[PDB]
Design a protein around this ligand. Structure first.
Ligand SMILES: [Mg+2]
Ligand SMILES: [Mg+2]
Ligand SMILES: [Mg+2]
Ligand SMILES: [Mg+2]
Ligand SMILES: [Mg+2]
Ligand SMILES: [Mg+2]
Ligand SMILES: [Mg+2]
Ligand SMILES: [Mg+2]
Ligand SMILES: [Zn+2]
Lengths: 201, 61, 136, 116, 48, 86
RNA sequence: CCAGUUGACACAAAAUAGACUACGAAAGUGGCUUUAACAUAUCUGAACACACAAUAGCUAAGACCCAAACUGGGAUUAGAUACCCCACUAUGCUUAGCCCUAAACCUCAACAGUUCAACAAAACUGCUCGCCAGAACACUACGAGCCACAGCUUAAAACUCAAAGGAC
């Protein structure tokens, strides 16, 4: 046990403190406080989705470089958008979108596997058991699929930022590798319309 | 369900049953002795059954 | 309020379901076998309405008599029946297996409503001595 | 009602047959039977079936079968909540049977006296 | 246990029931519908 | 075959709640005494094994009745600390 | 010529009562009707005898829903001649003959009466038929007897033993 049973983490929330509650505040005060970390700095730029994306992209414990590469890839995507809009052609703001929130929503929509797979044998033969999953597990699986697809590391020619940008642009328009993997998972789950009762939990 | 009471002899019930079974118009029917002839054994409800009257040895174990 | 007691056919069944007499509601035979489940909706005059068994689903093994597969087969049978006009039926269960309540739930999902849960399972009063005993 | 049991054991005075051959002595133990728990049932059957039907009608897109996938996810969340509620009630309130500890303590207060 | 009759009385009742079932004075696999007007004699557990 | 067709074992249903009618039919079958009969008829019950099954069933039933009587008799004591003397 | 309603529909037995101790010397016998009836108002009394007697196996008499040893195969282990499945011969049966076994164990003998080594069903008082007082050899050979011919009833002998055996 490297963590001491005395010291405890703090609470970084502060926007709500701008106007029962007093008792909760006194309780929070009467708590062995600790310092905040640098990697998971819960600041204004701490986006949970992008934070988890950078954490997964973290290699050798270099979250700084991961976040820098993520920001650079987003900037490159926006630069391609400008080339299609402002940089090269004339500003056509009526048929072009520069908001990555739409891409993030489309991903959350069409990149979530709603059926898990666990090899649960019964006697001496593995059987696929389609078991439902909650929202947290589904979002985690979606993020993991997106990240492991962006991190191909097998083309032996494409670079990390180029790979990420190309895969994101391919998955944006309701296609790409992540959505195809989701469709394959759905088909596999459909293929087991009877082997969905061998679950111990 | 016609009921024809009679006083047939002792060794004739099987013969009468066979004759009835031989008939075509008769569905079926077992010739049973008169029910009121059976003298009822005067019973008086259920008696209080006692508990177990010793079924195991007496040992501390 | 709705007597579950045996509704004899005597004068007269004063309960209609969308214009249907209890003595003429189409029958729905559902054989709930141990490792199989069949949905054979036989009409009153012995006519077809939804003979959708697990064999036509795709698998021909123990996957027949299960839960989700049985419910999907029941939903398909209910859809096929509604395509011909049935809705209300008198379920006639046969055998004990997973295709007992799952089939009824699937039929309800499709659209067919159950009015009576009849079961004509084989009850041999010490007649046909069943198969011998077996070990594991 | 408690049925008869005199002419059922092999005893000295008893001249009948032992129709009841208990494998263990008939002594009301100080404990009670334990209530079963856990069972591989895999709930969520109607929503699974309707989702399968929708996916059969359509393909595998989430924007097409949204009306059914939302209900499927809601039913999965409800099943998880019911599992949590059952796990909590296992220590708070038991449905059907009572806590075996209650009867255990009650019998401990006034245990059996077969050995006189 | 539920009906609450004696040994001899219950034996005679079941013997008469069996005789009626064999000869043909009572349905075997169901109850006579022409004589349903019967007060709550036994404690019918089913249907409460 | 020679008996009337649809009269017995006809548990009606209403209100679209087949679960209620299902449970009613289950209770009826259990109180009648045929579910276990069919379950044992699934295979051949040897006469020795059949007598052993009947004996065990009778013993368990007597024990359960005795336990239920004892519970109904002793369920009164369920307070906490009425005296508090010790 | 298989799965689901209905129509001429099993030479085997009856489910809830079976949550009843009921009847027999024992095994054993419960859906109904019957032909007859279970000795002893003193007890025990033959394995030199008389009556027999769960199932098991056989010779004919017909086959059955089902199963049916051995058998054929399927997946199976180095090996399966077994554990899962399909069908079957004698067979589970009666109509005619048997052989004469059992964990026939409730392993507590019958008659009248009273208040412990341990598991079990606490002890017995008076009388009576049978049996035993080491284990494998020994449900055996040799004799004797049997409608039984790889069978059955009693049944040993030499060698080895420092033992065999029941309860906790
Ligand atoms: Mg016969
Ligand atoms: Mg004998
Ligand atoms: Mg057969
Ligand atoms: Mg063999
Ligand atoms: Mg044969
Ligand atoms: Mg015996
Ligand atoms: Mg003597
Ligand atoms: Mg002797
Ligand atoms: Zn009575």
């Amino acid at each position: 046990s490297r963590y001491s049973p005395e010291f405890k983490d703090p609470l970084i929330d502060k926007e709500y403190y701008r106007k029962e509650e007093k008792y909760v505040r006194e309780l929070k005060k009467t708590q062995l406080i600790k310092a905040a970390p640098a990697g998971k700095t819960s600041s204004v730029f701490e986006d949970p989705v992008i934070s988890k994306f950078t954490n997964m992209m973290m290699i050798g414990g270099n979250k700084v470089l991961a976040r820098s590469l993520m920001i650079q890839t987003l900037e490159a995507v926006k630069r391609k958008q400008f080339e299609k809009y402002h940089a090269a052609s004339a500003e056509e703001q009526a048929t072009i979108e520069r908001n990555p929130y739409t891409i993030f929503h489309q991903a959350l929509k069409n990149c979530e596997p709603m059926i898990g797979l666990v090899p649960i044998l019964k006697g001496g033969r593995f059987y696929q058991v389609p078991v439902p999953l909650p929202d947290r597990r589904r979002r985690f699986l979606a993020m993991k699929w997106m990240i492991t697809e962006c991190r191909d590391k097998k083309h032996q020619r494409t670079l990390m930022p180029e790979k990420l940008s190309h895969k994101l642009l391919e998955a944006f328009h309701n296609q790409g590798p992540v959505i195809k993997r989701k469709h394959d998972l759905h088909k596999m789950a459909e293929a087991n319309r009877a082997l969905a009762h061998y679950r111990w939990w | 369900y016609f009921l024809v009471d009679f006083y047939a002899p002792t060794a004739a019930v099987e013969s009468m049953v066979e004759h009835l079974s031989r008939d075509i118009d008769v569905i079926r029917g077992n010739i049973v002795k008169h029910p009121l002839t059976q003298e009822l054994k005067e019973c008086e409800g259920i008696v209080p059954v006692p508990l177990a009257e010793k079924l195991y040895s007496t040992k501390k174990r | 309020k709705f007597s579950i007691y045996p509704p004899i056919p005597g004068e007269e069944s004063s309960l209609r379901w969308a214009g249907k007499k209890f003595e003429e509601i189409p029958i729905a035979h559902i054989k709930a076998s141990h490792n199989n489940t069949q949905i054979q909706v036989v009409s009153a005059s012995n006519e077809p309405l939804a003979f959708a068994s697990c064999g036509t689903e795709g698998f021909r093994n123990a996957k027949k008599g299960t839960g989700i597969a049985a419910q999907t087969a029941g939903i398909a049978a209910a859809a096929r029946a509604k395509q011909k006009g049935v809705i209300h039926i008198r379920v006639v269960v046969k055998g004990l297996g997973p295709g007992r309540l799952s089939a009824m739930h699937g039929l309800i999902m499709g659209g067919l409503e159950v009015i009576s849960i009849t079961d004509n399972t084989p009850i041999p009063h010490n007649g046909c001595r069943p198969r011998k005993a077996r070990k594991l | 009602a408690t049925p008869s049991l005199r002419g059922r054991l092999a005893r000295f005075g008893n001249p009948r047959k032992p129709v009841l051959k208990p494998n263990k002595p008939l002594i009301l133990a100080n404990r009670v039977g334990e209530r079963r728990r856990e069972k591989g049932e895999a709930t969520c059957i109607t929503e699974m079936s309707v989702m399968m039907a929708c996916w059969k009608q359509n393909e595998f897109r989430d924007d097409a079968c949204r009306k059914e996938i939302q209900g499927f996810l809601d039913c999965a969340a409800r099943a998880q909540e019911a599992r949590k509620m059952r796990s909590i009630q296992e220590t708070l309130g038991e449905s059907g049977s009572l806590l075996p500890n209650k009867l255990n303590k009650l019998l401990q207060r006034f245990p059996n006296k077969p050995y006189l | 246990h539920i009906t609450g009759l004696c040994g001899k009385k219950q034996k005679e009742i079941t013997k008469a029931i069996k005789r009626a079932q064999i000869m043909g004075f009572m349905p075997v696999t169901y109850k006579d519908p022409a004589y349903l007007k019967d007060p709550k004699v036994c404690n019918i557990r089913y249907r409460e | 075959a020679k008996h009337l067709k649809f009269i017995a074992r006809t548990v009606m249903v209403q209100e679209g709640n087949v679960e209620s009618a299902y449970r009613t039919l289950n209770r009826i079958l259990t109180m009648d005494g045929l579910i276990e009969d069919i379950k044992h008829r699934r295979y051949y019950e040897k006469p020795c094994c059949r007598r052993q099954r009947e004996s065990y069933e009778r013993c368990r039933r007597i024990y359960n009745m005795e336990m239920a009587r004892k519970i109904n008799f002793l369920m009164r004591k369920n307070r906490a600390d009425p005296w508090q003397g010790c």
